[PDB]
Design a protein around this ligand. Structure first.
Ligand SMILES: CC(C)(COP(=O)(O)OP(=O)(O)OC[C@H]1O[C@@H](n2cnc3c(N)ncnc32)[C@H](O)[C@@H]1OP(=O)(O)O)[C@@H](O)C(=O)NCCC(=O)NCCSCC(=O)c1ccc(O)cc1
Ligand SMILES: CC(C)(COP(=O)(O)OP(=O)(O)OC[C@H]1O[C@@H](n2cnc3c(N)ncnc32)[C@H](O)[C@@H]1OP(=O)(O)O)[C@@H](O)C(=O)NCCC(=O)NCCSCC(=O)c1ccc(O)cc1
Ligand SMILES: CC(C)(COP(=O)(O)OP(=O)(O)OC[C@H]1O[C@@H](n2cnc3c(N)ncnc32)[C@H](O)[C@@H]1OP(=O)(O)O)[C@@H](O)C(=O)NCCC(=O)NCCSCC(=O)c1ccc(O)cc1
Ligand SMILES: CC(C)(COP(=O)(O)OP(=O)(O)OC[C@H]1O[C@@H](n2cnc3c(N)ncnc32)[C@H](O)[C@@H]1OP(=O)(O)O)[C@@H](O)C(=O)NCCC(=O)NCCSCC(=O)c1ccc(O)cc1
Lengths: 140, 140, 140, 140
């Protein structure tokens, strides 16, 4: 579901039940250095003024950047979790899709850093989100 | 109606269909300088690893900081929208609630800044979110 | 005069006495969309542990992003100032130079956003700095 | 010099020669949870338009937050270095002093997080800076 990296035999929460399944995030491409994902805008993505919620751009960036890290480190016995997210909002999105492209810009032993651009259907850059992903050894 | 500030007679999206109403955000207190909100953790707030989604903390902080700005400025002919958000994640939340407390730290003519704390049922500080809120004349 | 954009006949502080001239920042290229600058590492750029000061990367990014905004908007009656800066530090620099490359990513009516990369003499990416630049009518 | 924590018998760079000594940063109070410092504004602190440089607020926050961490962890065999700094600029400072107050808001095993308020001589809040400080075991 959502085409998230398949790194474990089971997961605590089914895709369709998570925030990500609820709003409809879907991953398209995914490599160690770059990953893309998108979502259809519907009310569930919007806030009361009719624009895509700022939290939705943060949430798509976070899932994409974290899972793109999980895709690499999980089989190395590590876990990956968001430690910091900085999002800037340049243009509202009223409808259509949001498309996210994540580029890896640093991969340290304790911290990976991704830049995520969020664009509307015309290709305009509506938001960007910088994420720092902590990598730590798994607890079992 | 999540108890959001009732500033207009019509809104483009009803509470219950917004991302906010979908995950269950509810505002408890609101004054010009300070506001609080909370949410019950359910799967809809979680990611597949069973923890509250990073985007959920961002979304809660975004709605609370923005709407507490709306509450003041709307009657002044102004629109308020999120311009930037920086969220840092200190401890995960697996279940219970997330409680948010937004404190206004600067109210400029064009920009309001709010610090938002996010705490678990034990009161521990699990994340913080700084929100910068652009304030502009409402377009006809 | 650090090669900063020559937009006015007088400036309140001469280059050589500013923080910029004190540490030795010099702009190499400037266009509306992209600009570069660099500095020689000396003790004046370092902290007591012998590494380049975190504030130095921030200062370089701040001067480069702002003044590249000044270069466009000054002749339009506008002032440009730093509104927010987020800097992330990936590898220390002990000696040599720091080279900065600022790329404009959004140019709004009130806000320009620039991403700045900071690299060592080996070309490695040592820090990044996102700058948000407020653009306002110049006060008489 | 500058009243920085005295944790080692020698340091790679003398205070008066560092960025911090050059601009005149001085620490006043310092405890595990809170630390204050200040600096006299002079041209060396300013940029060409006559206001305190954005980099100077970042640099005072960074030195104060990092050294406040060093004060605690150094005798535990750890080093502390800035990993991320997010600074927002609310009001310019033309002259007098900048006074920084750093409050610790989270102390993890790998990351300490400090909020630093920067005020002018009238007490007005002119900038804030959030820092994440990485703590790692020393390399010898
Ligand atoms: C933050 C962090 C330690 C995270 O490490 P990481 O993400 O785990 O990366 P990794 O550990 O993969 O190693 C990356 C590089 O970091 C350095 N590093 C990592 N761990 C250590 C360590 N325990 N000891 C020394 N260097 C280390 C080292 O350069 C390493 O390269 P290599 O020697 O292994 O090739 C690393 O990214 C880093 O060092 N970043 C740069 C930190 C920096 O230079 N910050 C700016 C200075 S902020 C401090 C400041 O301004 C200040 C001012 C005044 C004052 O009085 C005090 C402080
Ligand atoms: C960013 C902004 C303009 C936003 O304005 P706002 O949030 O709407 O606040 P508001 O407009 O309510 O006014 C707040 C104060 O800002 C100043 N200000 C605001 N608008 C203006 C304007 N159009 N013209 C002049 N001052 C203004 C003024 O001090 C005002 O106080 P008051 O005189 O109105 O009482 C305001 O918060 C601000 O001025 N912040 C401080 C900016 C600052 O000092 N940044 C760092 C330095 S500039 C970046 C830099 O380091 C650099 C380095 C080297 C170099 O070569 C060039 C630049
Ligand atoms: C922040 C700002 C207003 C700054 O404006 P700027 O940097 O000067 O850009 P500029 O003014 O050049 O205009 C860019 C676009 O912004 C929009 N915009 C700018 N000013 C205005 C205005 N006064 N009125 C309406 N739209 C405006 C408009 O789309 C404009 O495009 P155009 O129609 O002019 O072609 C603009 O960049 C912006 O609109 N960014 C997007 C803001 C956004 O979508 N944020 C997240 C959602 S709102 C936060 C939230 O999640 C929330 C959640 C729950 C809740 O209950 C309430 C809120
Ligand atoms: C980031 C970090 C690991 C840094 O750890 P630290 O600063 O070293 O703190 P310390 O390690 O002192 O321990 C703090 C707590 O962190 C947790 N933690 C630390 N290390 C680990 C670890 N190796 N394994 C599990 N938990 C850990 C643990 O809760 C610990 O408490 P305790 O069990 O020891 O009492 C910790 O601060 C943390 O876990 N922060 C919260 C991370 C978080 O919840 N982020 C939000 C989610 S972002 C991810 C996301 O949204 C996503 C969405 C969709 C999707 O498909 C995937 C991901």
């Amino acid at each position: 579901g959502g085409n998230l990296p398949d790194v474990a035999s089971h997961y605590p929460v089914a895709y369709e039940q998570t925030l990500d399944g609820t709003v409809g995030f879907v991953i398209d491409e995914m490599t160690p250095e770059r990953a893309t994902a998108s979502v259809e805008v519907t009310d569930t993505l919007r806030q009361r003024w009719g624009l895509v919620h700022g939290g939705a751009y943060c949430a798509l960036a976070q899932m994409l950047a974290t899972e793109a890290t999980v895709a690499v480190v999980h089989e190395k016995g590590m876990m990956a979790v968001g430690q910091s997210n900085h999002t800037s909002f340049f243009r509202p999105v009223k409808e259509g899709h949001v498309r996210a492209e994540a580029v890896r810009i640093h991969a340290g032993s304790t911290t990976w850093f991704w830049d995520v651009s969020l664009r509307d259907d015309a290709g305009r850059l509506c938001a960007v989100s910088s994420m720092s992903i902590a990598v730590r050894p798994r607890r079992d």
